[PDB]
Subunit: 149 residues, 3 copies
Amino acid sequence: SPVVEVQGTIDELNSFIGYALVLSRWDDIRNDLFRIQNDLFVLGEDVSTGGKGRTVTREMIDYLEARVKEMKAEIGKIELFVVPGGSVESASLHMARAVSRRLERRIVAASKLTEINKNVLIYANRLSSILFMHALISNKRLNIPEKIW
Amino acid sequence: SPVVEVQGTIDELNSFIGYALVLSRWDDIRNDLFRIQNDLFVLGEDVSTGGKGRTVTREMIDYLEARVKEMKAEIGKIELFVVPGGSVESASLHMARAVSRRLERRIVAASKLTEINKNVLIYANRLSSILFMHALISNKRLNIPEKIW
Amino acid sequence: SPVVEVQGTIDELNSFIGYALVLSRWDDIRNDLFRIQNDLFVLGEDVSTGGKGRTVTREMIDYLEARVKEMKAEIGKIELFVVPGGSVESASLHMARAVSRRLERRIVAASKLTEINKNVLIYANRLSSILFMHALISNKRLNIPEKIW
């Protein structure tokens, strides 16, 4: 309000990511998540300072994209319509992903009323993607098959 | 936006249900929850395709109602103002229930701007009810009394 | 809608608090949380009955403030920009805190359309504060250092 809603959602997302992090059992995913938590403070500042302070960089976005590609290689084909769940590790990541998608919606809504750097929405979008991959990888490493609709 | 918000909330709800499912210890509740997760994909399609694709059926609604009646028989009298919590199993179901109630609110809001089949809101309403019953049953089976306000 | 959104958020918050309560390992925090869950029913009635029924008292607000001061003494200096997480106990409290902050936003929005007692927003604000302190105390007692951005 106008960006207070976005800021609040970033905060909520960060808390959900912290929860997923505590449950994660792998260093690569844990490192991704901790990096993201720090990136979210930058995203918040970018949005709040109208881009006058620290800003979301293309490098930050590229890291998420690179990790997504790497994990897609580990998973292989991804059948559409994955039922979210399986393990608590994956479940927590799917909940975090849902909040990240809500963040995307809030950014889009706020952008129509206030100026927001394009990298903010782009980062949020890539974050939703990496969290989905984290969820799939977690189940795979725990020997839990995905259920499809 | 107009239904993007509803779709996003369905997604969030599905993730919370998946979490509650992983924590559940009984086949009847687990089966209800998995059925619901699949029903939510149908609900999403109904809303997105304006009812042109798959739609929420009265049969789907009736199943939830039948299960609610069955569980009400197991619980007996339900004193109003149950403090949500007790066990992690029940706590997760109460969180899922809160999101389902949010889904109801989002459907009502969207229905004033776009056409949405009546079965969509009805299903969402019954879902909020069954999740409440799941929470009560879970505590009962775990020997945890409910706390009342 | 106008206060239906506030009521729904209070419900969601109560469910998140119940989750954090189940995970808590200390009587002081557990007692605070249970008191809050009961206070939330009062907050809901205050909002719904337009202040005609039970209302949020200054005493209820004072209790939260007193507990916050007490816990600040246990923590000592609080470096700004705490990354939410560390333990599942703290993570759940940070998630609850995010929902409480959302409640604050919803109350502010609703107050511009309907009359709401000032104690309602004040209580919500203090609740967000105490949950943050609960999260810090939980990690401290579990020998988990906070991570700072």
